Amino acid sequence: GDDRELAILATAENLLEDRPLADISVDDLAKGAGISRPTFYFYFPSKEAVLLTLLDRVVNQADMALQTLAENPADTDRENMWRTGINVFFETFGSHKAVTRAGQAARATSVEVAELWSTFMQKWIAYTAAVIDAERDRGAAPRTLPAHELATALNLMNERTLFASFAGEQPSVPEARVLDTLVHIWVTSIYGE
Amino acid sequence: GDDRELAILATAENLLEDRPLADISVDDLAKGAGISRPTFYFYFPSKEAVLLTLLDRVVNQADMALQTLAENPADTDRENMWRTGINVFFETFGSHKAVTRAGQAARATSVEVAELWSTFMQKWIAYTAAVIDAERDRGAAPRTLPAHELATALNLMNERTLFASFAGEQPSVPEARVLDTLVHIWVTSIYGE
Numbered sequence: 465g466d467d468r469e470l471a472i473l474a475t476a477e478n479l480l481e482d483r484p485l486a487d488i489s490v491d492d493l494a495k496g497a498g499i500s501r502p503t504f505y506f507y508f509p510s511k512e513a514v515l516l517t518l519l520d521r522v523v524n525q526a527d528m529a530l531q532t533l534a535e536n537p538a539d540t541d542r543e544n545m546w547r548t549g550i551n552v553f554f555e556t557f558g559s560h561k562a563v564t565r566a567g568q569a570a571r572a573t574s575v576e577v578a579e580l581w582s583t584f585m586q587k588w589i590a591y592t593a594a595v596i597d598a599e600r601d602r603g604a605a606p607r608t609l610p611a612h613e614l615a616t617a618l619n620l621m622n623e624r625t626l627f628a629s630f631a632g633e634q635p636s637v638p639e640a641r642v643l644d645t646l647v648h649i650w651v652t653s654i655y656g657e
Numbered sequence: 658g659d660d661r662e663l664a665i666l667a668t669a670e671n672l673l674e675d676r677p678l679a680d681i682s683v684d685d686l687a688k689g690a691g692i693s694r695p696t697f698y699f700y701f702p703s704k705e706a707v708l709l710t711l712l713d714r715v716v717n718q719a720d721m722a723l724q725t726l727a728e729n730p731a732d733t734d735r736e737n738m739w740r741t742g743i744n745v746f747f748e749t750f751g752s753h754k755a756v757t758r759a760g761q762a763a764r765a766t767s768v769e770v771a772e773l774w775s776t777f778m779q780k781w782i783a784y785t786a787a788v789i790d791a792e793r794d795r796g797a798a799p800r801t802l803p804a805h806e807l808a809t810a811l812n813l814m815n816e817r818t819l820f821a822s823f824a825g826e827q828p829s830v831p832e833a834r835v836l837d838t839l840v841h842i843w844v845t846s847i848y849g850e
């Protein structure tokens with residue numbers, strides 16, 4: 465079970481580097497995984513379900529990395545604190561660009577992909593707002609915008625900006641500049657009065 | 658010519674308030690415009706071409722409003738200067754939410770829609786960077802990030818945040834909060850050291 469499922473998922477991630485999900489057949493997935501087509505349908509109903517599982521894996525990888533960071537004591541340097549956090553997403557999604565690209569596109573056509581992304585964005589926004597609230601409570605950040613509203617716009621900026629950078633969209637921030645760009649906007653907007 | 662073309666465009670904008678372009682037929686468009694199907698094909702090749710023209714109209718409306726603002730002397734109050742500028746996009750796109758929603762979705766499936774949006778984003782980013790550069794030259798803004806990179810992330814934030822707000826996505830900034838939210842992040846990031 466585990467082994468043939470993992471092989472299908474690995475094959476899908478590899479083929480999505482070359483082409484979009486529309487141009488990948490179940491035959492391609494079964495062939496890559498060394499199984500028959502009917503055996504593929506035992507593990508997944510569709511190529512779309514495979515992408516959902518890949519995206520779920522990547523999103524939970526980012527979330528579990530963020531939880532690991534949240535568990536350790538807080539970085540005493542506020543800019544570095546936020547940079548290490550944004551970097552979890554930069555490195556996790558940047559290490560899975562094909563799944564990232566395909567998953568964002570699938571939000572349009574898949575309610576399960578749209579709901580997965582929504583769910584995790586709400587969790588990441590809530591956490592961001594809780595950190596901003598803690599910074600205000602300790603007198604390290606000014607009481608300016610509603611923290612949850614600020615957190616929402618900053619998280620949406622990172623969603624759009626990181627995906628544009630990884631896809632090489634025109635326009636985009638160069639990948640080698642995007643972490644510095646986003647940290648600057650987070651720190652100035654969280655700590656600026 | 659002008660009159661039947663305008664009627665098709667008006668019908669399309671009206672029907673997109675009720676449903677997506679996928680659920681609107683050429684019959685629906687011709688019927689709404691008081692023409693036959695074959696007469697529709699004289700003016701446009703597809704329902705997709707109608708949406709392209711609607712989006713083109715809206716994007717050029719925003720751009721021409723921004724040009725009008727760019728022509729007048731600069732607002733002496735830096736926060737108000739940026740607020741009046743962001744408000745051009747808030748009001749223009751917010752007044753055409755059905756075309757906005759349908760056009761953003763069509764970027765996925767239409768190279769002409771994707772190129773239209775890209776073209777105008779590059780123009781708006783260039784203008785933003787030129788204003789930031791002028792603010793630095795006059796000693797009103799600090800020389801922090803590369804202006805074009807800062808401008809790119811701020812414009813992508815507005816793209817994603819305003820569209821989420823107008824679509825009522827979860828998550829989103831409430832529409833009644835989104836202008837204040839974005840102005841705060843632009844002003845703190847442009848003027849913060």
Ligand SMILES: COc1ccc(NC(=O)N2CCC(C)CC2)cc1
Pocket residue numbers: 546549550551553554557588589591592595619620622623624626627
């Ligand atoms: C590609 O999509 C996203 C990429 C990044 C984000 N969010 C973040 O960077 N953080 C920064 C650190 C914070 C404590 C949690 C949120 C959201 C979406």
Ligand SMILES: COc1ccc(NC(=O)N2CCC(C)CC2)cc1
Pocket residue numbers: 739742743744746747750781782784785788812813815816817819820
């Ligand atoms: C919905 O998509 C966008 C909505 C807004 C923008 N950009 C802007 O707000 N401005 C602010 C003022 C500046 C001088 C030009 C750019 C881009 C995309």
